[PDB]
């Protein structure tokens, strides 16, 4: 059935629990305060979606919608001290499609070449600059893929950093 999906896994003696709420097709301003006390918010953004367009509007890049959703959930009144772990996915499809089409299709003021690195850093910067609260929260960004287990390692390290910094703030030492 639909609803929130709950996932458990143990990694280096830590029991990670994750809650997928993509099945919730309703107003998010009525249940998002339930997740007020979460260690981190893992946000997935597909890099290969700059060329694509959402069929609902036919003039709406899915990357712009991802940016809107990320900004909405980042600067929420409840997540004022919660860290966000960004996952820029499908780096390979981006690698070929940037060779085919420039990133100017999505952002009209890109002003750059068609190499993977410039566009990747550009999308990362455009996402991270949407963090208006640059004092009490941090964004950790990855590029995933690699068909490996480095993703859980990155999540573990980022969660450990979040926990340590939370303790430091609670002590006043940060």
């Amino acid at each position: 059935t639909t609803g929130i999906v709950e996932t458990h896994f143990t990694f280096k003696d830590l029991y990670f629990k994750m809650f997928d709420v993509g099945a919730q097709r309703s107003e998010r301003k009525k249940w998002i305060h339930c997740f007020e006390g979460v260690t981190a918010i893992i946000f997935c953004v597909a890099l290969s979606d700059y060329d694509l367009v959402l069929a609902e509007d036919e003039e709406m890049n899915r990357m712009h919608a991802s940016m809107k959703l990320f900004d909405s959930i980042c600067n929420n009144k409840w997540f004022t001290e919660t860290s966000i772990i960004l996952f820029l996915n499908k780096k390979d499809l981006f690698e070929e499609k940037i060779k085919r089409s420039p990133l100017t299709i999505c952002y009209p003021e890109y002003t750059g070449s068609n190499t993977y690195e410039e566009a990747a850093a550009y999308i990362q910067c455009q996402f991270e600059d949407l963090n208006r609260r640059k004092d009490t929260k941090e964004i950790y960004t990855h590029f995933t893929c690699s068909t490996d287990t480095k993703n859980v390692q990155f999540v573990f390290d980022a969660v450990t950093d979040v926990i340590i910094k939370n303790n430091l703030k609670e002590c006043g030492l940060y």
Binding site: E138, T160, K165
Partner: peptide, 28 residues
């Protein structure tokens, strides 16, 4: 004294971001 040297001269190191970046560099 060292810390004073940081606070008055070279005051561009007096940032939350640098401190958090180093504490991340601890075990990340």
């Amino acid at each position: 004294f060292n810390k004073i040297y940081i606070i008055l001269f070279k005051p561009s190191r007096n940032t939350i971001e640098e401190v958090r970046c180093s504490t991340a560099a601890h075990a990340f």
